Amino acid sequence: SGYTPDEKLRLQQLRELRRRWLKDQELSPREPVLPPRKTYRHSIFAVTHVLIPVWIIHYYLKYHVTAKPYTVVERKPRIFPGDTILETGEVIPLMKEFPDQH
Amino acid sequence: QQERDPWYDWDHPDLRLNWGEPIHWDLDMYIRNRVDTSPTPVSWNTMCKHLFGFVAFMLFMFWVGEIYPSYQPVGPKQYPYNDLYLERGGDPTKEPEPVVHYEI
Amino acid sequence: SFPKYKPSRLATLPATLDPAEYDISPETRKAQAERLAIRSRLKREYLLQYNDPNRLGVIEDPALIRWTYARSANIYPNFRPTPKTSLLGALFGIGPLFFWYYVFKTDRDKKEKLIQEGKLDQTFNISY
Amino acid sequence: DAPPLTLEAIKDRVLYVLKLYDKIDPEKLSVNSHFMKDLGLDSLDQVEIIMAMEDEFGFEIPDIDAEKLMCPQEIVDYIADKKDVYE
């Protein structure tokens, strides 16, 4: 097929109008008229965002969560032969004499 | 609407509908977010046969492999103290039947 | 030469493989022209309303109104209790109820019989 | 991110593709050179030219609009209108 004269003319006129519309859609140098109304950054970020939550959480855990039984339960440390129990000053003895396997 | 022509200038480009034209009784089902009836490269019967054959063959071979398992030429793993009788929760009061392991 | 494509309900026949797309009669061209004329008339009406500067609101769609009315408010007046409708309604409205009743009754009877015989593991079950 | 297109750049690229076509004499080729009236091509050649433009500009021209682009200027206008180029 092809463009009939009417279609071609209408397309030309619409292209002109559309290009003018876009040119109007451009902005002016003054156009945004607002109302009249780093070690330092990382330091001020590290004190608040890190130091305040850790203080709050440590205070909450040490004096409120641990004030109730069984709230904080820690798996007991592994005791190996030939060790020293620090709580009671105890000595956990060694194992037998290993038969050499080479 | 998925089957409908995408390059036409519809009045509702997302729904691919025109103003005033009759609406299919099942438009709520045939939107582009739902059931699609567009033609496929492979026939529906062929696709169904291939999928069913694949899944059935996989299930049959899984059953065959279950009744013919794979292992290694080794004996059962040996554990001490009556196969760890107390460690697995055995009753301390009762005396288990002894399990003795010998060297070889 | 090549394997043929077999259309289905969810795998409908493509427009390029439709046999009627290649056997065209002069009446078919007239029908196509009539369809195009109807579409053009509807498009012209819609575009006039859509480009009217004084219009402020929603262009009411009679087709949408008819669809919504037919799907909701036009069902019962056009319903006749034919044998097909009677059987389908009875099945789809009663069969599931009796099926689930039988299933749950059997399950609960088995559980109650086990409880009465005292061979059901109810230990640690203190929340019901 | 990508630099915006311009009318001159679009015209240069389409004329570049047309001059790289072997069935068009570069000396007699202009933006108003009709592919069939004064360039002596046919429907298949026009389809191939449209496909070459699609490959060049990285987008597809629908067949309803591709059958009517018989001039390099028409192709430029179509591409600019689709891409919203006004300068």
Place this chain on the structure above:
Amino acid sequence: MNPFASLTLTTLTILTIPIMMSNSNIYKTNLYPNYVKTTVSYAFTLSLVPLLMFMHTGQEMIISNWHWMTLQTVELSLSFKMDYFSVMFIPVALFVTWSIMEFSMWYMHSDPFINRFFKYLLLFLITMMILVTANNLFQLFIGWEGVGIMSFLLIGWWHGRTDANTAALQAILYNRIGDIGFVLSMAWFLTHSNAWDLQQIFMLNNECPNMPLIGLLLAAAGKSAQFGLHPWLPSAMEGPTPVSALLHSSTMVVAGVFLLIRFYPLMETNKLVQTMTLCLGAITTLFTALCAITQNDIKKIVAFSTSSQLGLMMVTIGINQPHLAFLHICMHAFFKAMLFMCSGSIIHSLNDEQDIRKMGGLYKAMPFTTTALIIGSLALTGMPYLTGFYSKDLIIEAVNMSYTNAWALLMTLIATSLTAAYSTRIIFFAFLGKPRFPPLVLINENNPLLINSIKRLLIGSIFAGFIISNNIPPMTVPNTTMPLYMKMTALIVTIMGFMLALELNNTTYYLKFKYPSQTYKFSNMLGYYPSIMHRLPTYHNLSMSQKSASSLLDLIWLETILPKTTSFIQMKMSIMVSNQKGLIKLYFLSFLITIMISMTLFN
């Protein structure tokens, strides 16, 4: 007290902090993405600290800080389990999220809602942390649903795309089937143990039964996109590349594997559920790899690779090796996130082009991206001393030396070969050969954000498996003795896949054209599963919803029985009663009949 619980909770709290700041001018300005990235990096360090604490003495703690509510004899409280899995997965997730956030700062630069994008990413990270650190089933379910709905929101980031909307809805549907399984497991556990917490569940369930373990398995399969519920993961690539890199492949799709790892005592107790897990993982990895080897969309190829790795993890769980699965989770997170970042860099450089048939010449066009992708593909296939070696090789060795399904073992080996094959396909069609992109070359990868993020995820794809495997205690007995041909089985199949894929890719340069085969059509069409299973059940359900429930029952028969029949009867009776003609003779004769009846038939 102890700096363990305090620092873990502090990491969680500092993760939650920027969400509160979203109502401020910091969120209104363009510094918000950098602020969120800095917060994530600080959280990563503060989470590295408890990881160092654990690796010394193996310290594990549970914190039950806030008591929510007591349902008679069942107490629900906010409890966190800071065990090995949590303290090992938190730093990895934070590291990956930090890299992805820098990559997104580079990538989503022109998006008008980049601040909202980063807010959604942080919310997803918070929900994932809740899921990982949850100690009870209710909190685990909270995290489960949170990550599910965040995935729904982020998949459909471009609200105007119908494909994105339907992909999000499909993901929600499959995850809701998984949630059905999860709710079944929760109900069984509460009914038969009077507890929703892992401690009492493990204490009371010495022999866990098929119903709860099948519920858990169904939930895990739904979350990790196993066979039957897989297609949502490949379709979830409609979202932005940062979403695919962070959410799905790295941290979200491992939720089901993590859930199965958390109940490894019960999994050990049962056998049938272990066999089912093994079979499901094997079929999933095989099918997903087979679909991957013939895809043309790079994001889809990487998604199917992720699905295959998830299937391998499920296989590892089915052979009673929970910790190897966790190690593979970590290593896979690393190199899969790096691969997704490299694919996104390629896509962005080529003007939103996601086709390897148009990619080409990138080996010299994009040096750093090529190097990173080569290293990631080597780690993915199990290069003998990369991150993927310390997990995949051990997994294959454990599968070989086990009393497992022979078909599952064979499918695992074939899946490894196909993994090598699709890695070869990606490399060959993306970087080797001649250019196939449009003539306007806009390739530029010299952005410091992109370079630094890929570099950080690149050092972790070489020197992380070694450190992690050398810094963890032995939780399983090693397989020291095995035949030589079984010790190098993974390498042999990987090299075979490499060679066969390279040969078939080199055959594409010949001037010979042949129509595709039935096997090729089956593999490229994703096994026909999305077509049949997304057209037939949906059509039938949406048809019965209208034909039977709405029209036949509600609009016709429920109206006919009670209100319409009664109304018709009353109307007919009213007509009969009031149809009198007002004739005194007639109703006086009626009076006479009534008089006679009353006189005679009334005693």
Place this chain on the structure above:
Amino acid sequence: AFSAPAAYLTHQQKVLRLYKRALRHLESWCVHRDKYRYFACLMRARFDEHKNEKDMVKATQLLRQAEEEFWYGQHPQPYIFPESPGGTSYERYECYKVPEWCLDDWHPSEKAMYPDYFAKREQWKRLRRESWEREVKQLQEETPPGGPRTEALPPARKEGDLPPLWWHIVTRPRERPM
């Protein structure tokens, strides 16, 4: 999308669309450029071999057989341009497209933030409001008594007029509105 469709596709249009589809799917199969060029030359050789055919019935039969061959031999996953329907970037920016009628619901402070733009917007609105009667008169003058037979709109005959029904076509949102 910019052209009004016809009532039917002629034989030339059918064969040209088939030729373009076959070339695109062949390019999808033949990834490399030299191989694609070779096989595209072969395909056009076939088309030119069948180009001269006076018998329209035989031409239609050849077209039908070619369509069957194309459907059998099509690529299951053909290449699609990212912005084309079915592409990975199709409809991506539809959520960023906001119209001028939304633009005129702004607050006076927001409008004062952009003083120069809204003067031109008011000029455009006046231009639209001063032409609607001429547009509708021209449309109703040129239509047949039965009604429109096609979706093609006439251009502006007079110098001071504008092509009827131009407002939304001209003021449609940009392809990258944000």
Place this chain on the structure above:
Amino acid sequence: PDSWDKDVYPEPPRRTPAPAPQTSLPNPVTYLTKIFDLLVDRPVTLAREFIEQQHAKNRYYYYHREFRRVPDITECEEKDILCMFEA
């Protein structure tokens, strides 16, 4: 704090092995513990000391309500609403 009954909430004695290093490398866990004690534990301890000093300024007590025993439903007569309510 330990404001609960050890008999009601039993806890086995805690055996912590003594640190016996076998290498010359410093302990990052120990250094980080020292840093945590210097930066967090001491400030929170000071804050808690101030707060507890403020609490001791005005000290008041609350009691546990004791309920008397009443006859139960076994001793209650039939249709005796008051006794039934108490029971």
Place this chain on the structure above:
Amino acid sequence: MGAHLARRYLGDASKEPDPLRMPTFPPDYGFPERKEREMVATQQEMNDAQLMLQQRDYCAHYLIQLLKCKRDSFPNFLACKHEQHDWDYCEHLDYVKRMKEFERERRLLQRKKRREQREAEMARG
């Protein structure tokens, strides 16, 4: 994987051993004097070390030594190579003992088959 699977599934399953049921013969059958295996680590020591139940085999003392070595020299994780090798060698010896048990079961089963076939031949003639 191996030839034993082929022998059992495509041959005489009666002569091939059953992994889930072996051992079948008495441990003293054919061994005039057999020594019971010795366990070095005690139950209390394993409980204190908190070894996993799958790790509390006869090679547990080497695992305990390895854990103690790893904990003591924490920052230098490239230290307990000797302990790791000792544990691996102990596990290797356990595995070869299991292989010896399997082979003994196999050849005892085949010897029983030969004896019963000889008895059948004697009974027949």
